[PDB]
Structure 1
Amino acid sequence: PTVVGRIPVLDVRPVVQRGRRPAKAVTGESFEVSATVFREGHDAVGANVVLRDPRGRPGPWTPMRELAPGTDRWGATVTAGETGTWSYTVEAWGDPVTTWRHHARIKIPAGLDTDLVLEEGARLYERAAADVPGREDRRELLAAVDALRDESRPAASRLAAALTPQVDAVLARHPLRDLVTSSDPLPLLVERERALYGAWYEFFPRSEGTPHTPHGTFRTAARRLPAIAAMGFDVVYLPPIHPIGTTHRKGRNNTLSATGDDVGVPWAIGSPEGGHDSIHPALGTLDDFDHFVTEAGKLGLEIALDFALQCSPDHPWVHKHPEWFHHRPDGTIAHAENPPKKYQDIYPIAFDADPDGLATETVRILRHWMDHGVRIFRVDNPHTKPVAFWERVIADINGTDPDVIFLAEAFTRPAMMATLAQIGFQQSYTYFTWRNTKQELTEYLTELSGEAASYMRPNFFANTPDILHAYLQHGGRPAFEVRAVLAATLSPTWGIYSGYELCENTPLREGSEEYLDSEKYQLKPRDWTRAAREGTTIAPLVTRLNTIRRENPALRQLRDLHFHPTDKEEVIAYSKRQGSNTVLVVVNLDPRHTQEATVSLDMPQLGLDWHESVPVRDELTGETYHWGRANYVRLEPGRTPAHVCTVLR
């Protein structure tokens, strides 16, 4: 048996790990399946994609086209339906009708062998007719057969009868395929919409308390949920909600020794009060948590819990499972690190003495929170635990509960970032915050929206508790407006960490990405009511951005994206499409000066002729414009960060 078939079909894409892991989609998501298809000699080939659902049922006729001339690379778009494990095959075949047509159109006017040529076409068309299930369509092709064979009629006339629009339509739908050859099937994991699309808000429940009880509880924190839902968010990400250690507890601003009232860092998990399956007593009980989750659900909010596989020195695991830690020769356990950052308040887990025990406990813990309605886990620093460990855990959890979504917070090198997605993380954090110039943004999003989208789904948090970028520090409110627009329009998942709306941008010191008086080490009450009435919050822009996303399919996908040229380096333009919805975005990346530029639209890439002039609406302002090939913009920081335009139907 040979490796190559009768009609070569090679290097089908997408492929992940040579086919040992699945390519990814979500319900309703479209992507391109490609392959290299050609044959011996000079006749035409054709190709089609066969998509098969979890029950093995084939999808519709999906013909491919050569993507670039001379390349022999063919592609077609397909769309994922219900969730589960699917497969895809490319079929390649000889296309003797296109071949015959080509020769006939030349030979018949040339008067070469006209009778023989016409009879050859007749016999092809007859075979094409025997396959066609439609009776009307069959009649249409037999009619052409008769005409081709009518030796009383002129050659050019007989031939034209085989090339009519309605003959073409039948053959496009039901082609004569010679020597059909199939690739081996490749796997596709189709997951729920939220895996790709959703808007995330991160906050610390303990900061939302009262005058009498400063340390907020799940019952007091629940009062923030309505305002979070009204901003158009879908997911609430909570830092660790468990008891927090007392030994080597950190004080305010990442100081080494906590004083009497200091609350410490949520990520220092565990004390005699409980571990990863417990609630910090100052937040309340598990019933209070249920109330929180229930209230969230009624508002259309899902909860994402933080999962940080690490311990404070007071965690019960320290004495109950000492072999889950590496002990130095004097018995001590080295505190965790991410240099030059030190985490003196925690111990990292060791995985090589009891991997099975660690895996079993981990899935028990996740299943506990799952039983309480948490169907999304934000995995803290996954890259400091074994890659195969995450592979096994996710596979175990999705085996019984395929809706559960894991987000990898791995700010690390590309190989690890990619591998973590490929072994099963539904979402990844990304380099977004360190991509601030037009060249950085264009390059990174080209990468994210290209081949990487077969395995990685990005979550663009414009900030986190650990990341306050210099761009926001030096930019002020107009920088916050820009980044919000970008994150929200460039990824179908984006997020902010509470305080972003208020444009909090004071660093620990010059050249740091830490916030001053960071919420990680202290309660951080905020006067939300005053910021609203005084207008010192960008919460209305944020709300508008999420509304636009909810109203425009184009912004709920990743892969269709294109950058249009502009004559200003500060000014970036791009477009996204889904069916007939097309969103056009122009952003001024300069937060200090007004920028004017000419934006030159790739009109065909919008599906328009070059000379066309289509109307748009800037959904940020409601204002209408008529745009075409070349368009003047003028964007004033503080007044307008961008144009976020929909092309009017």
Structure 2
Amino acid sequence: PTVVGRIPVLDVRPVVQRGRRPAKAVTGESFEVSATVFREGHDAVGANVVLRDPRGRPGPWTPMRELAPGTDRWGATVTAGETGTWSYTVEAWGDPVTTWRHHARIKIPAGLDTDLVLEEGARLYERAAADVPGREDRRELLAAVDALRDESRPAASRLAAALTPQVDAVLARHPLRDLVTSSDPLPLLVERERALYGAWYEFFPRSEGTPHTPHGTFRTAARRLPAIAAMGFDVVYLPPIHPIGTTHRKGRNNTLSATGDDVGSPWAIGSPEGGHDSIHPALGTLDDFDHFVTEAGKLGLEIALDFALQCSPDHPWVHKHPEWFHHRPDGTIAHAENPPKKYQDIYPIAFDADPDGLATETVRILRHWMDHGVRIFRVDNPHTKPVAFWERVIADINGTDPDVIFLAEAFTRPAMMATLAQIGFQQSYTYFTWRNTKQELTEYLTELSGEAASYMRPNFFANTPDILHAYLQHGGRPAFEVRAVLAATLSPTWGIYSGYELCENTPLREGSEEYLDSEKYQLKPRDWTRAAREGTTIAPLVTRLNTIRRENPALRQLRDLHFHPTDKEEVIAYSKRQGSNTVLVVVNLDPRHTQEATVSLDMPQLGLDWHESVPVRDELTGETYHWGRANYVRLEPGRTPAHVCTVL
């Protein structure tokens, strides 16, 4: 058997790790399948993509086209249906009809071998008709044959009969394919919509307490949920909800020694009160948690729990499973680190003594939370645990529960980030917060929406409790508005950490990306009602952005994205399209000065002619404009950061 088939079809894409891992999609998501296709000699080829579902059923007729002259690179758009494991192949074939048409269009007006040429055509159309299932279509082709086979008609008329629109249409749906040759199947993993699309909100339940009881419970915190749903979020991410260690507990502002009533870091998981399968007592009971999850569900909110595979010195595992830790010669355990960050309040897990036990317990914990309605897990620092560990665990869980979504919080080097996405993580944190210039945003989103989209789904958190970027520190509220517009419109999944709405932007110190008085080490009660009343929140803008996303399919996908040139470095423009839905966004990245620029739109990417002029509506303001190949903007920081426009 040969590696190359009768008609060469090579380098089918997307492909992940030479086919040992699946490419990714979600229900209803479109993407391009491509291949290198050609044959020997000078005759024509055709090609088509055959997509098969988990039950083995082939998809619709899906012909490919050469993507650029002389490249032999062919492609077509496909769309994923029901969730599950699909497969796809590319079929390549000789296209004798196209070749015959090519020669005939030349030879008939030249009187060259006309009887012979027309007869060759008749014999081809006969073969074509042989494989057409519908009887009227078949008869249409046989009628073409018969007209071709008629020496009483002029050569030009005989040829013309072979060139009618109805014939073109039949051959379009059921072409005569010579020597059909197939690629080897590639795996495609189709997961649910929320894996790609959703708006996330992070907050600390313990901060949402009462005057009488400052430490919030699930019962008290659930009162915040309606406000979160009203802002249009779909997923709530909670920091670890388990008991917190006392030994080496951190004090306020990440100080080494807790004093008095310091509450410590949620990531310092575990005490005699229980471990990762337990709830912090100040939060309430398992029944209270169930209540919280239910109220969230009623409001259209899914819960994402933090999973941080590490533990405090007081965690039961420390004495129950000593071999789950690396011990120095005196038996002591060094606290965990991810330099230059130090985590004096926790021990790291060692994975090479009892990998089976660690995996088994991990999936036991996960399956526990899944039993209590948690179908999403935000995984802390997975890059400091073995890659194959996550591969195994995720495979186990999704093996039984494919709806479960895992989000990789890996701010690290590109190789590790990519590998983690490839082995099963449904979503990944990204370099987004560190991409603020037009060049940074454009290059990075070009990357994310490009080849990487075949294995990675980005979750754009505009901030996190560990990351307050300088852009926001120096820029204030207009910057929050800009970053919100950007995050919300560039990724089908985005998120913020509570306080972002209030434009909280005071750093621990100059040069730091930490918050002053960080919520990680102390309760941080917020007067939401007052902020709302005094209008010092961008919650309305957040709500509008999520509504716009909910009303415009173009913003609920990733791969279709195009940047348009402007004449100002501070002003960026880009468009996203999904079916007949087109959204155009123009953002002023300068949070301090009014910026005017001319935007020169790439009209064919919008599906328009260069001379054409089209009506747009700015969904942030309701204003309408008429935009063409050259458009003036128009952006004043504070009054408006950006246009988020739909094409009318």
Normalized against structure 2, the TM-score is what? 1.00
Q: Which residue of 1 aligns with 2:158?
A: 158
Where do 5+ consecutive residues of structure 1 fail to align? none
Q: Secondary structure at the match of 2:57?
A: coil
The residue aligned with 1:416 is: 416
Distance 2:476 2:429 in 1: 24
Structure 1: distance between partners of 2:43 and 2:441: 44
Distance apart, 1:157 and its partner CA: 1.3
- Secondary structure of 2:609's aligned partner: coil
Shift of 1:379: 0.1
1:533-565: per-residue Cα shift (whole Å, max 9, x none)?
A: 111000000000000000000000000000011
Aligned mates of 2:377, 2:618 — CA distance in 1:
36
CA shift, 1:149, in A, is: 1.3
Measured against aligned partners, the alpha-carbon deviations of 1:314-340 in whole angstroms (never above 9, x if no partner) come to 000000000000000010001000111
Q: Residue by residue, what CA displacement relative to the aligned partner does 1:103-146 show, whole Å, maximum 9, x if unpaired? A: 10011111111111010011001111111111221121111111
Shift of 1:234: 0.1
Q: Deviations over 1:66-110 (max 9, x none)?
A: 001100000001011110100000000000000000010011111
- The SS at the match of 1:125 is helix
Residue of structure 2 equivalent to 1:585: 585
> Which stretch has the larger CA shift, 136-145 or 334-343?
136-145
The offset of 1:236, in angstroms, is 0.2
- Residue 259 of structure 1 and its aligned partner are, at CA, apart by 0.1
SS at match of 1:577: strand
Q: What displacement does 1:519 show? A: 0.1
1:398-436 residue CA offsets vs partner (Å, 9 max, x unmatched): 011110000000000000000000000000000000000
Question: Which SS does the other structure have where 2:500 is aligned?
Answer: coil
Question: Equivalents in 1 of 2:353, 2:12: separation in Å?
Answer: 41
Task: Note the C-alpha offset of 1:492.
Answer: 0.1
For 2:512 and 2:243, the matched residues in 1 are separated by 29
**C-alpha distance in 2 between matches for 1:614 and 1:179:** 47
Name 1:215's counterpart in structure 2.
Answer: 215
Q: What does residue range 291-310 of structure 1 map to in structure 2 within 5 Å?
A: 291-310=291-310
Tell me how far apart the structure 2 counterparts of residues 350 and 18 of structure 1 sit (CA, whole Å).
31
Alpha-carbon offset, residue 147 of structure 1: 1.3
Aligned residue in 1 for 2:59: 59
Find the residue that maps to 1:576 and give its secondary structure: strand
CA distance in 2, matches of 1:187, 1:282: 47
Cα deviation 1:332-361 (Å, max 9, x = unaligned)? 001000111100000000000000010000
Distance across 2 between alignment mates of 1:474 and 1:338: 27
CA–CA separation in structure 2 for the residues paired with 1:361 and 1:626: 60
Residue 517 of structure 1 and its aligned partner are, at CA, apart by 0.1
| Residues in 2 aligned to 1:113 and 1:594: alpha-carbon distance in whole angstroms | 72
- Distance in 1, Cα, partners of 2:345 & 2:645: 48
- Counterpart CA distance in 2 for 1:73 and 1:402 is 34
1:252 and 1:450 mapped to 2: Cα distance?
Answer: 43
**Shift in Å, 1:27:** 0.3
Displacement of 1:612 after TM fit? 0.8
SS of the residue aligned with 2:244?
coil
**How far, CA to CA, are the matches of 2:643 and 2:140 in structure 1?**
52
C-alpha distance after superposition, 1:363-398 (max 9, x if no partner): 000000000000000000000000000000000000
Deviation digits for residues 280-336 of structure 1 (CA, Å, limit 9, x no counterpart): 000000000000000000000000000000010000000000000000001000100
Where 2:109 maps in the other structure, the secondary structure is helix
1:629 is displaced (CA, Å) by: 0.8
2:532 corresponding residue in structure 1:
532
CA distance in 2, matches of 1:632, 1:194: 37
**Distance in 1 of aligned mates of 2:541 and 2:328:** 53
User: Hey, what's the Cα distance between the residues in 2 that align with 1:153 and 1:271?
Assistant: 95
**Alpha-carbon distance in structure 2 between the residues aligned to 1:362 and 1:146:** 72
SS of the residue corresponding to residue 520 of structure 1 reads helix
Q: Which segments of 5 or more consecutive residues in structure 2 lack a partner in the other structure? A: none
Distance 2:13 2:579 in 1: 23
Specify the alignment match of 1:489 in structure 2. 489
Deviation at 1:254, TM superposition (A): 0.4
Q: Secondary structure at the match of 1:263?
A: coil
The separation in 1 between residues aligned to 2:584 and 2:272, in whole angstroms, is 55
Aligned to 1:397: 397
SS in 1 for 2:521: coil
Distance 2:308 2:39 in 1: 54
Alignment partners' CA distance in 1, 2:377 and 2:457 = 15
Q: What SS does the aligned partner of 1:55 have?
A: coil
Instruction: Tell me, in whole angstroms, the C-alpha distance in 2 between the residues paired with 1:44 and 1:366.
Output: 55
In 2, distance between residues paired with 1:573 and 1:160?
Answer: 48
Per-residue CA deviation, residues 194-245 of structure 1 (Å, 9 max, x unaligned), is 0000000000000000111111110000000000000000000000000000
Q: Aligned partners of 1:111, 1:216: CA distance in 2, in Å?
A: 91
**SS state of the match for residue 259, structure 1?**
coil
Distance 1:4 1:139 in 2: 37
Alpha-carbon distance in structure 1 between the residues aligned to 2:339 and 2:563: 37
Q: Helix, strand or coil for the counterpart of 1:453? A: helix
Aligned match of 2:359: 359
Could you tell me how far apart the structure 1 residues matched to 2:577 and 2:354 are?
49
| SS at structure 1 position matched to 2:501 | coil
CA displacement at 1:628 relative to structure 2 = 1.1
- Distance of 1:634 and 1:614 partners within structure 2: 18
Deviation for aligned residue 1:623: 0.7
- Matched with 1:239 is 239
SS in 1 for 2:77: strand
Q: Distance in 1 between matches of 2:335 and 2:425?
A: 27
**Which stretch of structure 1 is more off in the superposition, 174-183 or 105-114?**
105-114
Q: Following the alignment from structure 1 to structure 2, what is the Cα–Cα distance between the partners of residues 406 and 124?
A: 54
CA distance in 2, matches of 1:249, 1:62: 60
- The residue matched to 1:109 in structure 2 has which SS? coil
CA distance in 2, matches of 1:471, 1:108: 69
User: CA offsets per residue over residues 13-57 of structure 1, 9 Å max, x none?
Assistant: 000010000000000000000000000000000000000000100
The corresponding residue for 1:114 is 114
> SS where residue 283 of structure 2 aligns?
coil
SS at match of 1:212: coil
Residues 151-160 or 476-485, more deviating: 151-160
- Look up the match of 2:378: 378
Structure-1 separation of matches of 2:92 and 2:280: 60
Deviations along 1:501-553, whole A, 9 cap, x unmatched?
Answer: 00000000001000000000000010101111111000000000000000000
Query: Equivalents in 2 of 1:569, 1:150: separation in Å?
Result: 67
What SS class does the counterpart of residue 494 from structure 2 fall into?
A: strand
Q: Which residue of 2 aligns with 1:336?
A: 336
Shift in Å, 1:634: 1.1
Cα distance between partner residues in 2 of 1:573 and 1:163? 44
Q: How far, CA to CA, are the matches of 2:530 and 2:364 in structure 1?
A: 44
What pairs with 1:152-551 in structure 2 (closer than 5 Å)?
152-551=152-551
Distance 2:590 2:238 in 1: 33
Identity of aligned residues (%): 100
**Offset at 1:153?**
1.3
Equivalent residue number for residue 604 of structure 1: 604
Aligned equivalents of 2:446, 2:107: Cα separation in 1: 47
Distance 2:293 2:346 in 1: 28
Which residue does 1:623 correspond to in 2? 623
Q: What RMSD in Å do the two structures reach over aligned CA positions?
A: 0.5
**Rounded Cα–Cα distance in structure 1 between residues aligned with 2:238 and 2:47:** 49
SS at match of 2:108: helix
Q: Measure, in 2, the Cα distance between the counterparts of 1:18 and 1:433.
A: 32
